């Protein structure tokens, strides 16, 4: 889009209408005259545009009002309210910006943030830019969390997040402007390489490739029809998974393949019956004729002169014989065109099979690839909900961080009170405030204690899931929250980094698949990635496979890799690798997995439960309803942008606003 409207879209907001959030804080306006709303919207939109057109520096209220024309620059409580609201909910002045008005001399309110993930770091920056006192507690020796980036000499490779899923509406657009964030495109072409029991692997031909991909997509689309139109979502009391539905859709396709074959051969026979019951009349005529010819012959050898009865006998029999030589010609014609119509039918069979083996193994790659993107076996994805975030996807081709994604959390962590090697062990929250008990990760006996007005928890969903708990809540988190954690899904997927000295693959190719034999291990090293001038190939593990490869040694895993690469590029042309790295996300205790997914039996509504903060019981019973003390951000809290970097980022910005609103009041409903 173009204009002020394009700022709105780019900020994930409808240029032409007020959001429920805005209605919350501007009820006067939205209940009011149409006219005033359209003013508001322009103001909002314009103010955003400004932030965006230069987001390396803060936007003040004055700078904003400066750049307005009447009638918009006329009412200036409205302009001030708006600017503040935006500022608060990180729509403007977030990320890394040069401050115009240096910070509040003294800080109001104290917050402890658990985890220096991106969700954390973002909120922290906001809170501090709102002049609260903020301290982050990270168990790792480094920021970013699930934004890991391997480095050694000039060999750089992301073990954690790596892809910006389009700049169109992405807040990372803003960040990529506030940091060099060196952004490469991803060339979408992916050639596939099927094994052969050890025989050289042959690439798949473009005919196959294209056909199978299309079946796959068609199969997905199918599951969707299956879900919505047929309403196939429970099964023996248990919610239907996507994998479950895919099987069912495949079977039904193989069934149909047969039912065609059957009614085709049954069409053949029902003709054969006609042919058979014709051939019988034709035999039974030829017999009546043989006899009748003889009879005529005998009556024709009665030598003349003859009396008239014996004359009539000839004429009679003569006629009766040309009568049957008539009929046998009708039948002989019919015979001819049934036999033609029979080779017709036996020329045009219906399909032999739905999918061969060689096909169904390639399809299993397209499935592995989906199990990768979603970080979980399709047996676990909710049929009804797995694709719910699909309407909020950004626009523009997907990109990569060339210089390594860690650049970002690092940049965010500039000027923040971050306590690394600090493992939180217990969270206590009460009407009067909260205290947080941590330890030193190295000597665990060395204990820490932090008192604060409010706690923000960016602990990963896998951590929140640990049984027995890694972090204890005091008091315990309510039914509704724990149940929600129980229900949600937290997946897994791993990356293998292969450092070489010399670039043995095709340099102009970005990414290329591998097609193992069985379904059972479809995820295992199913895909490889190239990027920098650096001789790094990345190998991906997904699906049921990724969980099992964590119990297998780096060397065996690096083996299984090379073997695959040899069988493609030639046993001589594939060096041993200089540096190898393997992720183990499900076993890494500060993540306990890769990222969330919509488990069967969950819904998007759980993501909203996860964000809902906790308010303790009152200290002195019958004393007034307390303040909400314990908050939650993180990738698993953002219904519409889950399992991503931008998702976390936003969840962070979001809590910061909620907290500030709570502890520093709202100057923008004043």
């Amino acid at each position: 889009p173009s204009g002020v409207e394009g700022a709105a879209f780019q900020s994930r907001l409808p240029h032409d209408r007020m959001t429920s959030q805005e209605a919350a804080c501007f009820p006067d306006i939205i209940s009011g005259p149409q006219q005033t709303q359209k003013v508001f919207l322009f103001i909002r939109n314009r103010t955003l545009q400004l932030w965006l057109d230069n987001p390396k520096i803060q936007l003040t209220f004055e700078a904003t009002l400066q750049q307005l024309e009447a009638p918009y620059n006329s009412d200036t409580v409205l302009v001030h309210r708006v600017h503040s609201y935006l500022e608060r909910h990180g729509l403007i002045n977030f990320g890394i910006y040069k401050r115009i008005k240096p910070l509040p001399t003294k800080k109001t309110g104290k917050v402890i943030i658990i985890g220096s993930g991106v969700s954390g770091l973002a909120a922290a920056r906001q809170l501090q830019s709102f002049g609260m006192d903020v301290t982050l507690l990270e168990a790792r020796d480094r920021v970013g969390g699930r934004v890991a980036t391997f480095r050694k000499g000039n060999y750089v490779a992301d073990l954690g997040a790596m892809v910006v899923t389009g700049l169109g509406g992405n807040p990372m657009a803003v960040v990529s402007k506030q940091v060099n964030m060196e952004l490469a495109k991803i060339k979408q072409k992916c050639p596939l390489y099927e094994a052969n029991g050890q025989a050289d692997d042959v690439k798949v031909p473009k005919e196959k490739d294209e056909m199978v991909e299309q079946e796959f997509n068609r199969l997905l689309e199918a599951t969707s029809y299956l879900s919505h139109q047929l309403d196939f979502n429970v099964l023996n009391n248990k919610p239907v998974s996507l994998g479950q539905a895919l099987e069912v859709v495949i079977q039904l396709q193989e069934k149909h393949v047969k039912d065609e074959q059957i009614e085709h051969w049954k069409k053949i026979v029902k003709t054969q019956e006609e042919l058979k019951e014709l051939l019988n009349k034709m035999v039974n005529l030829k017999e009546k004729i043989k006899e009748l010819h003889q009879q005529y012959k005998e009556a024709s050898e009665v030598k003349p002169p003859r009396d008239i009865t014996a004359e009539f006998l000839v004429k009679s029999k003569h006629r009766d014989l040309t009568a049957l030589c008539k009929e046998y010609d009708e039948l002989a014609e019919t015979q001819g065109k049934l036999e033609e119509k029979l080779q017709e039918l036996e020329a045009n069979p219906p399909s032999d099979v739905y999918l061969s083996s060689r096909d169904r193994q390639i399809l299993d790659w397209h499935f592995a690839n989906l199990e990768f993107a979603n970080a979980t076996p399709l047996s676990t994805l909710s049929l009804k909900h797995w694709d719910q975030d699909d309407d909020f996807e950004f626009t523009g081709s997907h990109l990569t961080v060339r210089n390594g994604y860690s650049c970002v959390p690092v940049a965010l962590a500039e000027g923040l009170d971050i306590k690394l090697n600090t493992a939180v062990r217990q969270v206590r929250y009460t009407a009067s405030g909260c205290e947080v008990i941590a330890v030193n990760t190295r000597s665990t006996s060395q204990t820490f204690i932090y008192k604060c007005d409010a706690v923000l928890c960016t602990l990963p969903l896998g951590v929140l899931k640990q049984q027995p708990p890694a972090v204890q809540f005091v008091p315990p988190l309510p039914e509704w929250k724990t149940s929600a954690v129980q229900r949600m899904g937290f997946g897994n997927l791993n990356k293998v980094v292969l450092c070489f000295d010399r670039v043995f693959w095709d340099p102009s190719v970005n990414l290329f698949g591998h097609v193992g034999s069985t379904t059972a291990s479809r995820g295992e090293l199913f895909l490889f990635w190239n990027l920098y001038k650096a001789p790094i190939l990345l190998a991906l593990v997904a699906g049921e496979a990724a969980g099992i490869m964590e119990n297998i040694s780096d060397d065996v895993i690096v083996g299984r890799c090379l073997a695959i690469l040899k069988g493609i590029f030639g046993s001589s042309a594939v060096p041993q690798p200089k540096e190898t790295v393997v992720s183990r996300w499900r076993a890494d205790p500060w993540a306990r997995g890769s990222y969330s997914y919509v488990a069967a039996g969950s819904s998007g509504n759980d993501y909203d439960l996860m964000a809902q903060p906790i308010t303790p019981g009152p200290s002195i019973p019958g004393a007034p309803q307390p303040i909400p003390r314990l908050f939650f951000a993180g990738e698993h809290t953002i219904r519409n942008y889950p399992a991503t970097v931008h998702g976390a980022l936003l969840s962070g910005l979001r809590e910061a606003g909620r907290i500030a609103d709570q502890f520093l009041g709202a100057m923008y409903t004043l």
Binding site: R218, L219, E221, A222, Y225, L226, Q229, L230, F232, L235, E247, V248, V249, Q251, L252, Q253, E254, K255, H256, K258, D259, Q261, I262, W265, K266, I268, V269, Q272, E273, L275, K276, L279, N280, M282, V283, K286, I289, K290, L292, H293, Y296, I308, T309, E311, F312, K315, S316, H318, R319, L321, T322, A323, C325, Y328, A332
Partner: protein, 133 residues
Amino acid sequence: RKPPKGMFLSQEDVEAVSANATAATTVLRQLDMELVSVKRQIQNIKQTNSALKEKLDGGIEPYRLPEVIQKCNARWTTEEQLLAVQAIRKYGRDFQAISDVIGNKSVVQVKNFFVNYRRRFNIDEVLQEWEAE
């Protein structure tokens, strides 16, 4: 809106393949057997009709009568009158056959004949004799 092009999925089918824990591969095998049964039954009538075409081997040339056509004359000869009467006895009303038996009388002439001579050749008596068969 509706199942992708060429993907098949009836309400009925789904209930049926879901119904049990392996009513999936029941139904798929039930049809594999159903199929061979019909391929075997084909191999059979192919073999049956195969024999019956060997019995028609030779067509019916050995029994075909050459083609005689004389002009369709107008006059009723006594000879022709009698042929007719006998034909009637053997054929009933089949004017077509009767015309062919006589040779040189059209199917109208034959039809007229019926009504003129009707009196003198007691064709009433004759035609009910034919029905007594």
